[PDB]
């Protein structure tokens, strides 16, 4: 709506802040192994995926556009990251075999986006 602060400053300065948060969200660890292999109606999707995900992604996709100047703005990046998270959060329970390998990425990147100033204000 209005009164926000997710532009930070420049698209390139964002590629930088995106790097550190890339190390967090994308630490090449087991926590980030299943994130790039989510579920979708095109392949063994799950019941009702338009209210809990609508447009899911794979950590490898947002990464193919992250290193480039495609999703340097936290608005677009945080949009896919957050959705890519909600894609595996709105129905991953709180302690089952789905809300865990991604909960470490949500807690480690949510701390790297503030630095990215997407959460600046």
């Amino acid at each position: 709506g209005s009164h926000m602060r997710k532009k930070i400053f420049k698209p390139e300065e964002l590629r930088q802040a995106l790097m550190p948060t890339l190390e967090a969200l994308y630490r090449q660890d087991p926590e980030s192994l299943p994130f790039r292999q989510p579920v979708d109606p095109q392949l063994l999707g799950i019941p009702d995926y338009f209210d809990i995900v609508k447009n899911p992604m794979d950590l490898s996709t947002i990464k193919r556009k992250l290193d480039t100047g495609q999703y340097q703005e936290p608005w677009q990046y945080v949009d896919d990251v957050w959705l890519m998270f909600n894609n595996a959060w709105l129905y991953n329970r709180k302690t089952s075999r789905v809300y865990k390998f991604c909960s470490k990425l949500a807690e480690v990147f949510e701390q790297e986006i503030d630095p990215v100033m997407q959460s600046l204000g």
């Binding site: 579920v39 063994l44 799950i46 019941p47 129905y91 991953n92 329970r93 089952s96 075999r97 789905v98």
Partner: peptide, 20 residues
């Protein structure tokens, strides 16, 4: 039975990827 008999769809308890 030989042919289907009032079957229709069946949720069969399916909770997304938190089980399969």
């Amino acid at each position: 039975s030989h042919l289907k008999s009032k079957k229709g769809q069946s949720t069969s308890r399916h909770k997304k990827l938190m089980f399969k």
